[PDB]
């Protein structure tokens, strides 16, 4: 019973976007059984970033998803050893990102290590021109496969000139030792940028995230 | 108004799958403000279908979606002229379908005409080996774009031997006269095959479908 | 045997693009063992088309591909019964087309029947705004799979205001009577529009197309 | 000038595939104006790798492509400063890789630094089951866009028990300074594994690669 009602975390990311290398370090905290967490990030290398912060924000904590008692909480059940997760983001104008992450627990602190590679973003598109204004709230479709947990999302970044910039997410959640899987279910999420300095070298985020069955079941 | 609390519809489909031609005709009914409708289909040419009925079932009625008052009901507003809808289905083993449809109103009955082309299904896959057993309930992400309404879904067919077979839907809803569009929102659906003979030449379906904002808003 | 060194063909297409229905009829001729053929097309219904002709031109004859003696010519061998072909076109701005075709033979005359559905073309993209100026020459990668022949191409339309508009082709060629398949090989093609009236309701085309092994073999 | 008729290179890769971290160091040499080069790799962290080596082999040197004098050799022109390249690999069973690379020149040796993230490979697919046995020779379609050079390839791995495993490559070559771009053209390549130990912790490769116009031009 190592996951307490209040848990902190530390995170480090090493990333590249369109050839630009960067490193980010941060700290966060939250209420894993309530579905709330916050994180504060500093760009330690490669700042100011020449692309939109918004593509990085969902890579900084699903052990914090609230689950109903009848849905196995695969990510919480994976501790204390923890889990790895990986992701594809397919952007509608041809950008592609892959992400790989390790989640562990030491001394009561979650430790998150992230690597990120984004490629093929057009020079005049909204990522490289910094035209995005945050994510809409989203709904992930999850299911078990291959002994692990997978999920997909149709997400959207709001645009300064109006309209949306569409991104498909595909994620894989992989316990370090096999633990109990849920069935077909959904996770609702809303991620807010709650603070940032003028060139996004210091950034604060809040996420609400909760799992559930389809409403018609 | 012109759309009554109870409305009947007639539908005809001409299609092809992996070089196999077929035609289907049917009749349905439902309650457009309550979010449900039913339909009875007969394969009138090309039966018995050498592929899974389930890939056809979502092409047989979104004027029937229940919408809250604060979300403009674009498809209902499009009548009496009505609307056209188009779709891509991307299957995880490479099958691809496009669909085009016309929806009109004639003497108090909705009239649906559907054209369907499905290609590249593997000979050994669940579609051509008839290994599927219905869709999970689903959730569509919709937004306005290009003066029309668009939406995407991550759907899944249950496999008879266990597991899921994954399908991405992208739809386009196009009113024949430009009427009020909604913002970013979601539609939940659940489609059930309620009757079928052994070779699926006579089939009946039931769908529940309703629009809503994201739960966290 | 049945395929002479000069052969004529007739073709008919029923199609839809972004809700616009049309029909085209044509007549062609060529030298199947030499790798060239020509065709003249007339829009009989739905002209003038509200989109670029170029997306239709490659749907009007691969029995005319020149093959070296050591690569089985699947499509020629399929006659007199003939073959079916299907295809996906994935356009980089989200347009998707599927196509299904039947090829038959009547005394010296090939008979081509095509159905085409194209969806999700942006209103202001180069297809709906008629901004394309023909295809580059291309190179298809083919291989046997599932007892039929498949092939993929990275193609490109030239744009009037310079640059290219990218399209991926996936094709499936299915003989109506089992005949010998080749292994992994390539087909080079170049299709030219050689005449058109102002609104593209009358068009003539020339195609050169020849198969070969990879040059390093 | 700086690119001599014979050139050596050193390479290091940091990668992750399905959660498995690894590092590889290597050394190569070749004839940049003739289109031939060889490389020798050793795994230095993470061996033996739990996946097919073949997905790594094309990430180890396009400055060695032979170009005819009439096609601008953008990568050679980029030196001595050099170029960066990025890549997406889309595998037919859902695996996705992104790659990012820096190419520089030091003490008369090219220096290559690669980062690689591979995700979503099925546990029973041919990559994680090590069921592949090298690439077919291939042909890349290249064009200028957005101030850089881009290319795509339909590639294929041979399967030990027969058949092929298909993979689409999208590459982006980004000179560190704005050196002249070519037009629409093709690059043929053939990569062979020439030596390896059983667990692929020691591997030797050879590549032939040459650029050209389409053959019909």
Short mmCIF file of N, CA, C and O in Angstrom, two decimals, chain C residues 37-143:
data_model
loop_
_atom_site.label_atom_id
_atom_site.label_comp_id
_atom_site.label_asym_id
_atom_site.label_seq_id
_atom_site.Cartn_x
_atom_site.Cartn_y
_atom_site.Cartn_z
N UNK C 37 -0.16 3.24 -73.68
CA UNK C 37 -1.56 3.29 -74.11
C UNK C 37 -2.08 4.71 -73.99
O UNK C 37 -1.54 5.52 -73.24
N UNK C 38 -3.13 4.98 -74.77
CA UNK C 38 -3.79 6.29 -74.77
C UNK C 38 -5.27 6.16 -74.47
O UNK C 38 -5.80 5.08 -74.75
N UNK C 39 -5.95 7.19 -73.95
CA UNK C 39 -7.40 7.07 -73.72
C UNK C 39 -8.00 8.46 -73.84
O UNK C 39 -7.35 9.44 -73.49
N UNK C 40 -9.22 8.52 -74.34
CA UNK C 40 -9.99 9.74 -74.47
C UNK C 40 -11.22 9.58 -73.58
O UNK C 40 -11.83 8.51 -73.72
N UNK C 41 -11.50 10.57 -72.74
CA UNK C 41 -12.56 10.49 -71.74
C UNK C 41 -13.57 11.63 -71.96
O UNK C 41 -13.20 12.73 -72.41
N UNK C 42 -14.83 11.34 -71.63
CA UNK C 42 -15.89 12.35 -71.71
C UNK C 42 -16.67 12.24 -70.40
O UNK C 42 -17.10 11.12 -70.04
N UNK C 43 -16.82 13.35 -69.69
CA UNK C 43 -17.75 13.40 -68.55
C UNK C 43 -19.19 13.41 -69.08
O UNK C 43 -19.58 14.31 -69.83
N UNK C 44 -19.98 12.40 -68.70
CA UNK C 44 -21.30 12.28 -69.28
C UNK C 44 -22.37 12.77 -68.31
O UNK C 44 -23.50 13.15 -68.67
N UNK C 45 -21.98 12.78 -67.05
CA UNK C 45 -22.87 13.26 -66.00
C UNK C 45 -22.01 13.97 -64.95
O UNK C 45 -20.92 13.50 -64.63
N UNK C 46 -22.52 15.08 -64.43
CA UNK C 46 -21.90 15.86 -63.40
C UNK C 46 -20.77 16.77 -63.83
O UNK C 46 -19.96 17.25 -63.02
N UNK C 47 -20.66 17.07 -65.11
CA UNK C 47 -19.70 18.07 -65.54
C UNK C 47 -20.31 19.45 -65.50
O UNK C 47 -21.52 19.69 -65.57
N UNK C 48 -19.48 20.47 -65.34
CA UNK C 48 -18.05 20.30 -65.14
C UNK C 48 -17.77 19.87 -63.70
O UNK C 48 -18.46 20.25 -62.75
N UNK C 49 -16.74 19.06 -63.53
CA UNK C 49 -16.35 18.63 -62.19
C UNK C 49 -15.79 19.79 -61.37
O UNK C 49 -15.02 20.63 -61.85
N UNK C 50 -16.19 19.82 -60.10
CA UNK C 50 -15.68 20.86 -59.22
C UNK C 50 -14.36 20.52 -58.55
O UNK C 50 -14.02 21.13 -57.55
N UNK C 51 -13.62 19.57 -59.10
CA UNK C 51 -12.30 19.26 -58.58
C UNK C 51 -11.30 18.95 -59.67
O UNK C 51 -11.62 18.76 -60.83
N UNK C 52 -10.02 18.85 -59.27
CA UNK C 52 -8.95 18.54 -60.24
C UNK C 52 -9.12 17.20 -60.96
O UNK C 52 -9.24 16.14 -60.33
N UNK C 53 -9.04 17.28 -62.28
CA UNK C 53 -9.08 16.07 -63.10
C UNK C 53 -8.00 15.08 -62.71
O UNK C 53 -8.23 13.84 -62.71
N UNK C 54 -6.80 15.60 -62.44
CA UNK C 54 -5.65 14.74 -62.14
C UNK C 54 -5.95 13.65 -61.10
O UNK C 54 -5.29 12.60 -61.17
N UNK C 55 -6.87 13.77 -60.14
CA UNK C 55 -7.02 12.65 -59.21
C UNK C 55 -7.66 11.46 -59.91
O UNK C 55 -7.55 10.33 -59.41
N UNK C 56 -8.30 11.68 -61.06
CA UNK C 56 -9.00 10.62 -61.77
C UNK C 56 -8.09 9.96 -62.79
O UNK C 56 -8.38 8.83 -63.17
N UNK C 57 -7.07 10.65 -63.31
CA UNK C 57 -6.37 10.11 -64.48
C UNK C 57 -5.77 8.74 -64.27
O UNK C 57 -5.79 7.93 -65.20
N UNK C 58 -5.19 8.40 -63.13
CA UNK C 58 -4.61 7.06 -62.99
C UNK C 58 -5.66 5.96 -62.75
O UNK C 58 -5.31 4.82 -62.46
N UNK C 59 -6.95 6.26 -62.91
CA UNK C 59 -7.93 5.18 -62.74
C UNK C 59 -8.42 4.64 -64.08
O UNK C 59 -9.16 3.64 -64.13
N UNK C 60 -7.99 5.26 -65.18
CA UNK C 60 -8.33 4.85 -66.54
C UNK C 60 -7.29 3.91 -67.14
O UNK C 60 -7.91 3.20 -68.04
N UNK C 61 -4.96 0.68 -66.43
CA UNK C 61 -4.91 -0.17 -67.59
C UNK C 61 -3.58 -0.94 -67.62
O UNK C 61 -2.86 -0.98 -68.60
N UNK C 62 -3.34 -1.59 -66.46
CA UNK C 62 -2.02 -2.18 -66.23
C UNK C 62 -1.89 -3.51 -66.94
O UNK C 62 -0.79 -4.08 -66.84
N UNK C 63 -2.88 -3.99 -67.69
CA UNK C 63 -2.55 -5.11 -68.59
C UNK C 63 -1.56 -4.61 -69.66
O UNK C 63 -0.91 -5.40 -70.35
N UNK C 64 -1.38 -3.30 -69.89
CA UNK C 64 -0.45 -2.77 -70.90
C UNK C 64 0.96 -2.54 -70.37
O UNK C 64 1.80 -1.88 -70.98
N UNK C 65 1.29 -3.01 -69.14
CA UNK C 65 2.64 -2.84 -68.60
C UNK C 65 3.62 -3.79 -69.31
O UNK C 65 3.33 -4.99 -69.34
N UNK C 66 4.70 -3.27 -69.87
CA UNK C 66 5.73 -4.12 -70.50
C UNK C 66 6.51 -4.92 -69.45
O UNK C 66 7.05 -4.26 -68.57
N UNK C 67 6.56 -6.24 -69.57
CA UNK C 67 7.28 -7.09 -68.63
C UNK C 67 8.39 -7.87 -69.34
O UNK C 67 8.19 -8.38 -70.44
N UNK C 68 9.53 -7.95 -68.67
CA UNK C 68 10.61 -8.80 -69.16
C UNK C 68 10.21 -10.28 -69.02
O UNK C 68 9.37 -10.68 -68.17
N UNK C 69 10.80 -11.10 -69.87
CA UNK C 69 10.40 -12.50 -69.96
C UNK C 69 10.53 -13.23 -68.63
O UNK C 69 9.87 -14.24 -68.38
N UNK C 70 11.42 -12.76 -67.75
CA UNK C 70 11.64 -13.49 -66.50
C UNK C 70 10.76 -12.99 -65.37
O UNK C 70 10.92 -13.50 -64.26
N UNK C 71 9.86 -12.05 -65.58
CA UNK C 71 8.91 -11.64 -64.54
C UNK C 71 7.48 -11.97 -64.98
O UNK C 71 6.97 -11.40 -65.94
N UNK C 72 6.83 -12.89 -64.29
CA UNK C 72 5.49 -13.33 -64.65
C UNK C 72 4.60 -12.12 -64.81
O UNK C 72 4.55 -11.27 -63.92
N UNK C 73 3.94 -12.08 -65.98
CA UNK C 73 2.97 -11.00 -66.21
C UNK C 73 1.55 -11.41 -65.80
O UNK C 73 0.71 -11.80 -66.62
N UNK C 74 1.33 -11.33 -64.48
CA UNK C 74 0.07 -11.72 -63.83
C UNK C 74 -1.17 -11.21 -64.52
O UNK C 74 -2.15 -11.92 -64.80
N UNK C 75 -1.15 -9.90 -64.81
CA UNK C 75 -2.37 -9.30 -65.40
C UNK C 75 -2.54 -9.82 -66.81
O UNK C 75 -3.69 -10.08 -67.21
N UNK C 76 -1.52 -10.05 -67.61
CA UNK C 76 -1.81 -10.61 -68.96
C UNK C 76 -2.29 -12.05 -68.87
O UNK C 76 -3.19 -12.49 -69.60
N UNK C 77 -1.65 -12.77 -67.94
CA UNK C 77 -1.99 -14.19 -67.81
C UNK C 77 -3.44 -14.42 -67.38
O UNK C 77 -4.02 -15.46 -67.71
N UNK C 78 -3.99 -13.44 -66.66
CA UNK C 78 -5.37 -13.53 -66.16
C UNK C 78 -6.40 -13.57 -67.28
O UNK C 78 -7.55 -13.96 -67.02
N UNK C 79 -6.04 -13.17 -68.50
CA UNK C 79 -7.06 -13.17 -69.57
C UNK C 79 -7.17 -14.53 -70.21
O UNK C 79 -6.26 -15.37 -70.10
N UNK C 80 -8.28 -14.84 -70.87
CA UNK C 80 -9.40 -13.95 -71.19
C UNK C 80 -10.36 -13.58 -70.07
O UNK C 80 -11.18 -12.65 -70.21
N UNK C 81 -10.32 -14.28 -68.96
CA UNK C 81 -11.25 -14.00 -67.85
C UNK C 81 -11.02 -12.61 -67.28
O UNK C 81 -11.98 -11.86 -67.07
N UNK C 82 -9.76 -12.28 -67.04
CA UNK C 82 -9.37 -10.94 -66.63
C UNK C 82 -9.11 -10.84 -65.15
O UNK C 82 -8.84 -11.86 -64.50
N UNK C 83 -9.17 -9.60 -64.62
CA UNK C 83 -8.80 -9.40 -63.23
C UNK C 83 -9.59 -8.21 -62.68
O UNK C 83 -10.16 -7.41 -63.42
N UNK C 84 -9.63 -8.14 -61.36
CA UNK C 84 -10.16 -6.97 -60.67
C UNK C 84 -9.02 -6.19 -60.02
O UNK C 84 -7.98 -6.77 -59.72
N UNK C 85 -9.18 -4.88 -59.80
CA UNK C 85 -8.15 -4.18 -59.01
C UNK C 85 -8.86 -3.23 -58.07
O UNK C 85 -9.94 -2.72 -58.36
N UNK C 86 -8.21 -2.99 -56.93
CA UNK C 86 -8.72 -2.04 -55.96
C UNK C 86 -7.58 -1.17 -55.50
O UNK C 86 -6.40 -1.51 -55.68
N UNK C 87 -7.96 -0.01 -54.92
CA UNK C 87 -6.88 0.94 -54.55
C UNK C 87 -7.34 1.89 -53.47
O UNK C 87 -8.54 2.25 -53.36
N UNK C 88 -6.38 2.33 -52.68
CA UNK C 88 -6.48 3.42 -51.74
C UNK C 88 -5.54 4.54 -52.22
O UNK C 88 -4.38 4.26 -52.53
N UNK C 89 -6.05 5.76 -52.25
CA UNK C 89 -5.19 6.95 -52.40
C UNK C 89 -5.28 7.74 -51.10
O UNK C 89 -6.37 8.21 -50.77
N UNK C 90 -4.14 7.88 -50.39
CA UNK C 90 -4.05 8.69 -49.18
C UNK C 90 -3.37 10.01 -49.49
O UNK C 90 -2.16 10.06 -49.78
N UNK C 91 -4.12 11.10 -49.49
CA UNK C 91 -3.57 12.44 -49.84
C UNK C 91 -3.03 13.16 -48.63
O UNK C 91 -3.57 13.02 -47.54
N UNK C 92 -1.96 13.97 -48.73
CA UNK C 92 -1.30 14.47 -47.52
C UNK C 92 -2.15 15.46 -46.75
O UNK C 92 -1.83 15.62 -45.55
N UNK C 93 -3.17 16.06 -47.33
CA UNK C 93 -4.03 16.99 -46.60
C UNK C 93 -5.33 16.32 -46.14
O UNK C 93 -6.26 17.01 -45.74
N UNK C 94 -5.38 14.98 -46.14
CA UNK C 94 -6.41 14.21 -45.52
C UNK C 94 -7.44 13.61 -46.45
O UNK C 94 -8.28 12.78 -46.10
N UNK C 95 -7.46 14.03 -47.72
CA UNK C 95 -8.35 13.40 -48.69
C UNK C 95 -8.06 11.91 -48.80
O UNK C 95 -6.89 11.49 -48.72
N UNK C 96 -9.11 11.11 -48.96
CA UNK C 96 -8.90 9.67 -49.11
C UNK C 96 -9.85 9.20 -50.22
O UNK C 96 -11.02 9.57 -50.30
N UNK C 97 -9.36 8.35 -51.10
CA UNK C 97 -10.14 7.73 -52.15
C UNK C 97 -10.01 6.22 -52.07
O UNK C 97 -8.89 5.73 -51.88
N UNK C 98 -11.14 5.52 -52.25
CA UNK C 98 -11.01 4.11 -52.59
C UNK C 98 -11.62 3.90 -53.99
O UNK C 98 -12.53 4.66 -54.39
N UNK C 99 -11.08 2.91 -54.66
CA UNK C 99 -11.49 2.60 -56.02
C UNK C 99 -11.64 1.10 -56.17
O UNK C 99 -10.85 0.37 -55.56
N UNK C 100 -12.61 0.69 -56.97
CA UNK C 100 -12.76 -0.75 -57.26
C UNK C 100 -13.05 -0.85 -58.76
O UNK C 100 -13.79 -0.03 -59.29
N UNK C 101 -12.41 -1.86 -59.36
CA UNK C 101 -12.46 -1.97 -60.82
C UNK C 101 -12.59 -3.41 -61.28
O UNK C 101 -12.06 -4.31 -60.62
N UNK C 102 -13.32 -3.64 -62.37
CA UNK C 102 -13.39 -4.90 -63.05
C UNK C 102 -12.87 -4.75 -64.49
O UNK C 102 -13.26 -3.84 -65.24
N UNK C 103 -11.97 -5.67 -64.85
CA UNK C 103 -11.44 -5.69 -66.21
C UNK C 103 -11.83 -6.99 -66.89
O UNK C 103 -11.50 -8.05 -66.33
N UNK C 104 -12.48 -6.92 -68.04
CA UNK C 104 -12.93 -8.07 -68.79
C UNK C 104 -12.49 -7.93 -70.24
O UNK C 104 -11.82 -6.95 -70.59
N UNK C 105 -12.88 -8.90 -71.07
CA UNK C 105 -12.43 -8.87 -72.46
C UNK C 105 -13.52 -9.38 -73.39
O UNK C 105 -14.13 -10.43 -73.09
N UNK C 106 -13.73 -8.65 -74.49
CA UNK C 106 -14.66 -8.99 -75.55
C UNK C 106 -13.98 -8.93 -76.91
O UNK C 106 -13.72 -7.84 -77.42
N UNK C 107 -13.73 -10.07 -77.52
CA UNK C 107 -13.14 -10.01 -78.86
C UNK C 107 -12.18 -8.87 -79.11
O UNK C 107 -12.46 -7.91 -79.85
N UNK C 108 -10.98 -8.85 -78.55
CA UNK C 108 -10.08 -7.77 -78.97
C UNK C 108 -10.28 -6.48 -78.20
O UNK C 108 -9.50 -5.53 -78.35
N UNK C 109 -11.30 -6.37 -77.36
CA UNK C 109 -11.60 -5.11 -76.68
C UNK C 109 -11.60 -5.29 -75.18
O UNK C 109 -12.46 -6.02 -74.68
N UNK C 110 -10.68 -4.66 -74.46
CA UNK C 110 -10.73 -4.72 -73.02
C UNK C 110 -11.90 -3.87 -72.51
O UNK C 110 -12.17 -2.80 -73.06
N UNK C 111 -12.54 -4.33 -71.46
CA UNK C 111 -13.68 -3.62 -70.90
C UNK C 111 -13.44 -3.32 -69.43
O UNK C 111 -13.29 -4.22 -68.62
N UNK C 112 -13.40 -2.05 -69.10
CA UNK C 112 -13.05 -1.55 -67.78
C UNK C 112 -14.26 -0.87 -67.12
O UNK C 112 -14.84 0.07 -67.68
N UNK C 113 -14.59 -1.37 -65.92
CA UNK C 113 -15.67 -0.81 -65.10
C UNK C 113 -15.13 -0.27 -63.78
O UNK C 113 -14.55 -1.05 -63.00
N UNK C 114 -15.29 1.00 -63.46
CA UNK C 114 -14.69 1.61 -62.28
C UNK C 114 -15.71 2.26 -61.37
O UNK C 114 -16.63 2.97 -61.83
N UNK C 115 -15.56 2.08 -60.07
CA UNK C 115 -16.27 2.85 -59.06
C UNK C 115 -15.25 3.53 -58.17
O UNK C 115 -14.23 2.92 -57.85
N UNK C 116 -15.58 4.79 -57.86
CA UNK C 116 -14.65 5.69 -57.18
C UNK C 116 -15.35 6.49 -56.10
O UNK C 116 -16.39 7.11 -56.38
N UNK C 117 -14.83 6.51 -54.85
CA UNK C 117 -15.40 7.40 -53.82
C UNK C 117 -14.25 8.16 -53.21
O UNK C 117 -13.36 7.52 -52.65
N UNK C 118 -14.27 9.50 -53.30
CA UNK C 118 -13.29 10.35 -52.66
C UNK C 118 -13.93 11.25 -51.63
O UNK C 118 -14.98 11.86 -51.91
N UNK C 119 -13.30 11.33 -50.46
CA UNK C 119 -13.87 12.06 -49.34
C UNK C 119 -12.85 12.88 -48.58
O UNK C 119 -11.63 12.64 -48.68
N UNK C 120 -13.26 13.86 -47.80
CA UNK C 120 -12.40 14.61 -46.89
C UNK C 120 -11.39 15.48 -47.63
O UNK C 120 -10.34 15.71 -47.02
N UNK C 121 -11.68 15.97 -48.83
CA UNK C 121 -10.79 16.98 -49.43
C UNK C 121 -11.10 18.37 -48.90
O UNK C 121 -12.26 18.79 -48.95
N UNK C 122 -10.09 19.08 -48.37
CA UNK C 122 -10.36 20.42 -47.84
C UNK C 122 -10.94 21.36 -48.89
O UNK C 122 -10.45 21.33 -50.02
N UNK C 123 -11.92 22.20 -48.54
CA UNK C 123 -12.47 23.12 -49.54
C UNK C 123 -11.41 23.99 -50.22
O UNK C 123 -11.58 24.24 -51.41
N UNK C 124 -10.38 24.42 -49.50
CA UNK C 124 -9.39 25.31 -50.09
C UNK C 124 -8.11 24.59 -50.49
O UNK C 124 -7.15 25.28 -50.82
N UNK C 125 -8.09 23.27 -50.45
CA UNK C 125 -6.93 22.52 -50.94
C UNK C 125 -6.82 22.49 -52.44
O UNK C 125 -7.70 22.92 -53.19
N UNK C 126 -5.69 21.99 -52.96
CA UNK C 126 -5.42 22.03 -54.39
C UNK C 126 -6.37 21.17 -55.22
O UNK C 126 -6.50 21.45 -56.43
N UNK C 127 -7.01 20.19 -54.63
CA UNK C 127 -7.95 19.36 -55.41
C UNK C 127 -9.24 20.13 -55.65
O UNK C 127 -9.69 20.28 -56.80
N UNK C 128 -9.85 20.67 -54.58
CA UNK C 128 -11.10 21.41 -54.78
C UNK C 128 -10.87 22.76 -55.46
O UNK C 128 -11.79 23.31 -56.04
N UNK C 129 -9.65 23.32 -55.41
CA UNK C 129 -9.40 24.60 -56.07
C UNK C 129 -8.74 24.42 -57.42
O UNK C 129 -8.30 25.40 -58.03
N UNK C 130 -8.66 23.16 -57.89
CA UNK C 130 -8.06 22.94 -59.21
C UNK C 130 -6.69 23.60 -59.39
O UNK C 130 -6.43 24.31 -60.38
N UNK C 131 -5.77 23.39 -58.47
CA UNK C 131 -4.41 23.91 -58.50
C UNK C 131 -3.34 22.94 -58.98
O UNK C 131 -2.14 23.24 -58.88
N UNK C 132 -3.66 21.75 -59.48
CA UNK C 132 -2.67 20.75 -59.87
C UNK C 132 -2.36 20.83 -61.36
O UNK C 132 -3.17 21.39 -62.11
N UNK C 133 -1.21 20.35 -61.79
CA UNK C 133 -0.68 20.47 -63.15
C UNK C 133 0.04 19.19 -63.56
O UNK C 133 1.12 19.16 -64.13
N UNK C 134 -0.63 18.09 -63.22
CA UNK C 134 -0.12 16.79 -63.66
C UNK C 134 0.76 16.07 -62.66
O UNK C 134 1.31 16.64 -61.71
N UNK C 135 0.96 14.78 -62.91
CA UNK C 135 1.76 13.91 -62.06
C UNK C 135 3.22 13.90 -62.47
O UNK C 135 3.54 13.99 -63.65
N UNK C 136 4.10 13.72 -61.47
CA UNK C 136 5.47 13.35 -61.83
C UNK C 136 5.47 11.90 -62.31
O UNK C 136 4.57 11.16 -61.90
N UNK C 137 6.48 11.50 -63.10
CA UNK C 137 6.66 10.07 -63.30
C UNK C 137 6.89 9.37 -61.97
O UNK C 137 7.40 10.00 -61.00
N UNK C 138 6.51 8.09 -61.90
CA UNK C 138 6.49 7.36 -60.64
C UNK C 138 7.10 5.96 -60.74
O UNK C 138 7.38 5.47 -61.83
N UNK C 139 7.29 5.39 -59.55
CA UNK C 139 7.84 4.04 -59.43
C UNK C 139 7.13 3.26 -58.34
O UNK C 139 7.18 3.62 -57.15
N UNK C 140 6.44 2.19 -58.76
CA UNK C 140 5.63 1.37 -57.88
C UNK C 140 6.45 0.19 -57.40
O UNK C 140 7.21 -0.38 -58.19
N UNK C 141 6.31 -0.17 -56.13
CA UNK C 141 6.95 -1.33 -55.50
C UNK C 141 5.90 -2.44 -55.38
O UNK C 141 4.95 -2.24 -54.63
N UNK C 142 6.06 -3.57 -56.08
CA UNK C 142 5.10 -4.67 -56.00
C UNK C 142 5.65 -5.93 -55.36
O UNK C 142 6.87 -6.15 -55.34
N UNK C 143 4.75 -6.75 -54.85
CA UNK C 143 5.09 -8.01 -54.18
C UNK C 143 3.86 -8.90 -54.13
O UNK C 143 2.71 -8.40 -54.16
#
